[PDB]
Design a protein around this nucleic acid. Structure first.
Ligand SMILES: [Zn+2]
Lengths: 52, 121, 38, 47, 74, 52, 134, 123
RNA sequence: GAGACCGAUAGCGCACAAGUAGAGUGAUCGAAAGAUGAAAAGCACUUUGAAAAGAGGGUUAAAUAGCACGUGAAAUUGUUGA
RNA sequence: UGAGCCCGGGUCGAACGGCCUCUAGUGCAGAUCUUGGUGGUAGUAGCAAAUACUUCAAUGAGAACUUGAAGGACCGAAGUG
RNA sequence: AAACUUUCAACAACGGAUCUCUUGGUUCUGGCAUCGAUGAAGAACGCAGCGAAAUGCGAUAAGUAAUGUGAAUUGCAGAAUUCCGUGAAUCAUCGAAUCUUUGAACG
């Protein structure tokens, strides 16, 4: 979680309130990063993540 | 989006590091925007991964060349820069030690060596 | 059971991946004798 | 003591002990019937 | 069960009471090998796996285990 | 090869069974289980007078 | 007759080599002959085929048909020549596979590498011709 | 390919089915029952067989078949109702009738010239 | 590099994703399984059918070669005729 | 005489034969032979106990064992939870 | 008379024998001598745009560097190559590198 937070802050300029991680059955990790109220998840996803 | 080995060889350390950082940032951006509409962007990402490998290889080779120049005239060298050969080949006697001969044998060969001769028919 | 290890979980994942079927483009590849997963 | 089982029906072509729960068993067939006749003829010839 | 996974050979042949692999003998440094089972010897003999380095040795011998780079290389 | 046909573990089932008195392969989970072996008259077995 | 011990007269090994050769050996195998005018122009008999060559199919169902080589398909030892095609059931057009030993090169794709190849072949041929003549 | 090669294909309509999950014996008996008839009469008879109104005689494969009065239509006492075999024969007959309509023949004057049931690889 | 060898029940267990699939708690045991066609040119379009498929039509020298594919015996079975 | 040899018709596609010697893993009805395949028995024996299912409607090419409603039964907190 | 049982023939089934073929085996012969703490043999997990296995490779991951050849790969998709060029390739050679977890296995 510390590395995930540091990477999100350093690269994509995302501030996160918290991070919850699990390991999927296939072997990959899934991370739910809950962001600060100041930023908007929809705006960040549309701009930096390219997700509609 | 392909880098050239000759250009990387010509460039020095700082430019190689800057190029590697640029390639890695581009790789992250293209992956995030590739997860949707992975296409010719997949092609670009494949070429960019190969480029990152090329830059890393060039940096490592230049650093090893500098280290070899540093250890050119030193008695001990790192195992990485030491020759590999095989275990038995590394444990064999050196050429000088294997060709070393006793002084009495050296005198005998100096004064009574194998002579050239022919015998008629 | 519910209590396991990440390594055994990864082995289970590899078990499913091996128990994935065959691709049709593999079938259509030239010189191919593969028909079904054995 | 020993139970004799014919190698027929469910007992034909079995690797080992049949379903008959017994301490000691012996399987029989016509081939060993002829074996036994030859052995008995040799015994009579000896006597 | 009396047999779980051995780390050295990957089979379910590790006794849990004796703590010894029935196939390779994990605790012992040597790999279990007997000459009355040529089938087992050829099942786990060299060449049945990947040969990461022993495969690269012969080409180096052919070239003479030479070190360096070709003249004029960039 | 001198090992042609000798590379199996077979034993005769016995005399009391209504089957041919031929060495048969042990096992139980494949076609080769229970099949004849070590015979010049048997499939995947030896041949009479192996050539030397 | 074979003399040197390096050479093999074995059908099995010959066919293994032919059918498992890599791409470069496949190119050398798929070399094709030159036209007559090109022969008296270059003193070269044959040359590996490539994509820029114009050839004339002289054997097969297509008797004497010319065209520009569109694709050389080294995996199945065939080349694709322009317009020597057949329609599938659907009407979609697919090229026919014609062998380089069956095509004859009419106009050659000139570049530095192939000029060097032709120069080397000519040098060898003229040296041996001079040696045989005198 | 078809066994009966002496019939011209421009005047006849043919249907075929391979690897059908039905009983070979029952299918043979019912095909022999419907052999040589008009298409409409065969269809009506097969639907009656499904509805348990008429039954096919058990002639060759007739092990321990109970008797029924309908058997007197065939001069036999042992008759049976192979519903699934009847259904598949109806399917093939409708396919053949569609083929005859496509070729333009008169469907009212068609007879079943050839019928054959062979064994398929066993499952 | 070769052979008066064997030629898919033969020859190594293995001509093939074979020490594989599978069996045994385990030491271990351990198979079966090659071939369309010169070239996929692996049947467009129409019709019946829920579909699988079928019938026209078409490719090819050949579909009496349709990916249950070279040739295709006997056992056994169906139809036809005597 | 015979083991056998030869020709015709159909199928099929790529190699094969006669003669004199040489050579051998060379000739089959059996071996409760080996492997593979196929029969009669035979559409035969047989497809258990847990009391028990019924009506309408919907889906569907096709409905006893797909679903919704209603009726009749059951596990009976030491359960068919 | 039909049906049924049996016989003969043609076609069609079942089945995979015979003939043909062989990137396989088997035997003989010839040149050579080369595993490993600089971490071997073996096991494990990952790596392709689309891959399950075989194969290759190791987070530089069906691969990088260098040399050579000289214009491909291919099942599809997308890119190439200006071709009068340090340069395509599931290419060859191969002297530099990368080389995850165990395994003699070593906090
Ligand atoms: Zn072990």
């Amino acid at each position: 979680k510390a590395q995930i937070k540091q990477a999100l802050k350093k690269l994509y300029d995302i501030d996160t309130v918290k991070i919850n991680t699990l390991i999927r059955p296939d072997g990959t990790k899934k991370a739910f990063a809950r962001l600060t109220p100041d930023v908007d998840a929809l705006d960040i996803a549309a701009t930096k993540l390219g997700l509609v | 989006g392909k880098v050239k080995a000759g250009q990387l060889w010509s460039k020095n350390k700082e430019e190689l590091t800057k190029i590697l950082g640029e390639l890695k940032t581009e790789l992250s951006q293209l992956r995030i925007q590739k997860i949707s509409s992975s296409g010719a962007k997949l092609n670009k990402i494949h070429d960019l991964r190969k480029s990152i490998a090329r830059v890393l290889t060039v940096i490592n080779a230049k650093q090893r060349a500098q280290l070899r120049l540093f250890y050119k005239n030193k008695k001990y060298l790192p195992l990485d820069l030491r020759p590999k050969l095989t275990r038995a080949l590394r444990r064999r006697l050196s050429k000088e030690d294997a060709s070393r001969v006793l002084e009495k044998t050296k005198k005998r060969l100096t004064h009574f060596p194998q002579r050239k001769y022919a015998v008629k028919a | 059971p519910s209590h396991k290890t990440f390594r055994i979980k990864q082995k289970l994942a590899k078990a499913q991946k091996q128990n994935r079927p065959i691709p049709q483009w593999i079938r259509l590849r030239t010189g191919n004798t593969i028909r079904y997963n054995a | 003591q020993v139970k004799v089982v014919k190698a027929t029906g469910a007992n034909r072509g079995i690797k080992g002990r049949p379903k008959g729960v017994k301490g000691r068993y012996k399987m029989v067939d016509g081939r060993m019937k002829k074996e036994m006749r030859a052995l008995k003829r040799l015994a009579k010839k000896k006597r | 069960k009396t047999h779980g996974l051995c780390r050295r050979c990957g089979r379910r042949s590790l006794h849990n009471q004796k703590k010894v692999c029935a196939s390779c003998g994990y605790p012992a440094a040597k790999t279990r090998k007997y000459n009355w089972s040529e089938k087992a010897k050829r099942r786990k003999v060299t060449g049945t796996g990947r040969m990461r380095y022993l495969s690269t040795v012969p080409r180096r011998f052919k070239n003479g285990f030479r070190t360096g780079v070709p003249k004029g290389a960039r | 090869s001198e090992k042609a046909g000798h590379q199996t573990s077979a034993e005769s089932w016995g005399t009391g069974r209504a089957v041919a008195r031929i060495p048969r392969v042990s096992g139980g989970g494949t076609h080769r289980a229970g099949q004849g072996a070590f015979g010049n008259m048997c499939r995947s077995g030896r041949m009479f007078a192996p050539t030397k | 007759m074979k003399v040197r011990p390096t050479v093999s007269s074995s059908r099995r090994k010959a066919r293994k080599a032919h059918f498992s050769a890599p791409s470069s050996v496949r190119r050398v195998i798929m070399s094709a002959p030159l036209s007559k005018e090109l022969r008296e122009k270059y003193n070269v008999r044959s040359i590996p085929i490539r994509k820029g060559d114009e050839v004339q199919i002289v054997r097969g169902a297509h008797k004497d048909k010319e065209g520009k080589v569109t694709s050389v398909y080294r995996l199945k030892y065939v080349i694709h020549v322009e317009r020597v095609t057949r329609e599938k059931a659907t009407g979609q057009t697919v090229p026919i596979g014609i062998h380089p030993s069956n095509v004859v090169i009419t106009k050659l794709h000139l570049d530095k590498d192939r000029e060097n190849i032709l120069a080397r072949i000519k040098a060898g041929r003229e040296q041996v011709a001079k040696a045989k003549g005198k | 390919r078809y066994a009966a090669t002496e019939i011209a294909p421009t005047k006849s309509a043919r249907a075929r089915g391979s690897y059908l999950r039905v009983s070979f014996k029952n299918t043979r008996e019912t095909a022999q029952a419907i052999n040589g008839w008009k298409l409409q009469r065969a269809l009506t008879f097969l639907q009656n067989v499904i509805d348990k109104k008429e039954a096919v005689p058990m002639r060759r494969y007739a092990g321990s078949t109970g008797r029924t009065a309908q058997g007197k239509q065939w001069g036999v006492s042992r008759a049976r109702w192979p519903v699934k075999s009847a259904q598949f024969l109806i399917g093939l007959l409708k396919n053949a009738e569609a083929n005859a309509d496509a070729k333009g023949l008169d469907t009212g004057n068609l007879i079943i010239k050839h019928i054959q049931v062979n064994q398929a690889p066993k499952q």
